[PDB]
């Protein structure tokens, strides 16, 4: 009918502790059919962890067999994925995948489910303005600083400007997210016309609206 | 270990055009059972991978006629007959001949425009995190393309590499382009030893570096 996967994660996971993840499906028959184990983060790509075959052996990458079990309930449909000691890279979104038969190649997959192996605790962002140096178009920035988790969400003039805007991807820095937006307007604009940075933290209920005033020499 | 080696990781189109991908594996792919193992999957933003080509050549259920799949043994590669807005994403092969099974490290399949410098921004640290102890030099390169880019900071003449955290955005829907940010953190004490901070970007739209300063003065 509509072979469908879902797992079911913790989401953030601290550093040597374990992952335990669920894999439901509807559509098809564990006893049929077996269902893969797949992750993938910006360092390695997607990775293949392991797999529980429809007559129930498994099979695990050797990378991490030391740390990986596999195991499910035929009746229920469910598929349980645990992986302890977890690390930072250990940080990615993990997929279960149903295996074709005798194609052995993933056909259907879940949508996965973002895992964070972090030891951080919810920390509100600093918000500094971005003015150019003292000494046509003017290109103004915001850097939100040490905030965890992710995501936090930027805005100009409280939505009102929004073309010639770019928010960069978070980037890690001592176990917090920093980022930065800009916005580029007409010269004439700024700072004749007040331009703010809006950043709203919704793990930490803060926001905080930066206007970006000129230097001083 | 088995590699699966992609080529290009980086493809450039026109919608139209055709493409052609490459994969290589460093053991052949041709499975005891004499079937070959070998699939290429598509993943578009957000989404997980979905299957396209299985064994080869077997085009999956709802794939359209202009992907074809073919090679043999160690050598296969993937065609596009003529590349639709839909095709953008990011393509891979996968082994399940040999466990571990891989995957190849993805080839983007991206729009192709005319080649545009990048827009370079540089920002002193702000009075307010200077206020906090803090030192963050941000640099932003944007709306540029290619994507292949460089960029050096030099303080007071000197290259500085560490302390350097770059962030990149995805291709722009609207102008195809893309844009980074560059950002020095440095302790207040680390910043307060130097004068000139330098932000300078090499991209092949120019022989000479863009470049972009200011003096803490």
């Known amino acids: 009918e509509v072979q469908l996967l879902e797992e079911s994660g913790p989401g953030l996971v601290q550093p040597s502790q374990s992952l335990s993840i669920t894999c439901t499906v509807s559509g098809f028959s564990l006893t049929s059919y077996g269902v893969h184990w797949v992750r993938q983060s910006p360092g390695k790509g997607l990775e293949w962890l392991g797999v529980?075959?429809?007559?129930?052996?498994?099979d695990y990458n050797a990378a991490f067999i030391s740390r990986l079990s596999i195991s499910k309930d035929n009746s229920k449909s469910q598929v349980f994925f645990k992986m302890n000691s977890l690390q930072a890279d250990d940080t990615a979104i993990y997929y279960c995948?149903?295996?074709?038969?005798?194609?052995?190649?993933?056909?259907?997959w879940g949508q996965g489910t973002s895992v964070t192996v972090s030891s951080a605790k919810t920390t509100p962002p600093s918000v500094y303005p971005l003015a150019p140096g003292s000494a046509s178009m003017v290109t103004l920035g915001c850097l939100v600083k040490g905030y965890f988790p992710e995501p936090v969400t930027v805005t100009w003039n409280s939505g009102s400007l929004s073309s010639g805007v770019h928010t960069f991807p978070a980037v890690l820095q001592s176990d917090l997210y920093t980022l930065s937006s800009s916005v580029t307007v007409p010269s004439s604009t700024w700072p004749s016309e007040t331009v703010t940075c809006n950043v709203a933290h919704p793990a930490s209920s803060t926001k905080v609206d930066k206007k970006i005033v000129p230097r001083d020499c | 270990e088995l590699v699966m080696t992609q080529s290009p990781l980086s493809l450039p189109v026109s919608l139209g055009d055709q493409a052609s991908i490459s994969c290589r594996s460093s053991?052949?792919?041709?499975?005891?059972?004499?079937?070959?193992?070998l699939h290429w999957y598509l993943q578009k933003p957000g989404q997980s991978p979905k299957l396209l080509i299985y064994?080869?050549?077997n085009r999956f259920s709802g794939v359209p006629d202009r992907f074809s799949g073919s090679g043999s043994g160690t050598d296969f590669t993937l065609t596009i007959s003529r590349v639709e807005a839909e095709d953008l994403g990011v393509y891979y092969c996968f082994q399940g001949s040999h466990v571990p099974l891989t995957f190849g490290a993805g080839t983007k399949l991206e729009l192709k425009r005319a080649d545009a410098a990048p827009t370079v921004s540089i920002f002193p640290p702000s009075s307010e995190q200077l206020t906090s102890g803090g030192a963050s030099v941000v640099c932003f390169l944007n709306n540029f393309y290619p994507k292949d880019i460089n960029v050096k900071w030099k303080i007071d003449g000197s290259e500085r590499q560490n302390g350097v955290l770059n962030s990149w955005t995805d291709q722009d829907s609207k102008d195809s382009t893309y844009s980074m940010s560059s950002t020095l953190t440095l302790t207040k004490d680390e910043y307060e030893r130097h004068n000139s901070y330098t932000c300078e970007a090499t991209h092949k739209t120019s022989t000479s570096p863009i470049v972009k300063s200011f003096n803490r003065n």
């Open positions: 053991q052949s792919l041709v499975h005891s059972s004499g079937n070959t193992y």
């Open positions: 064994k080869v050549s």
């Open positions: 529980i075959w429809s007559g129930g052996s498994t």
């Open positions: 995948a149903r295996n074709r038969g005798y194609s052995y190649a993933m056909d259907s």
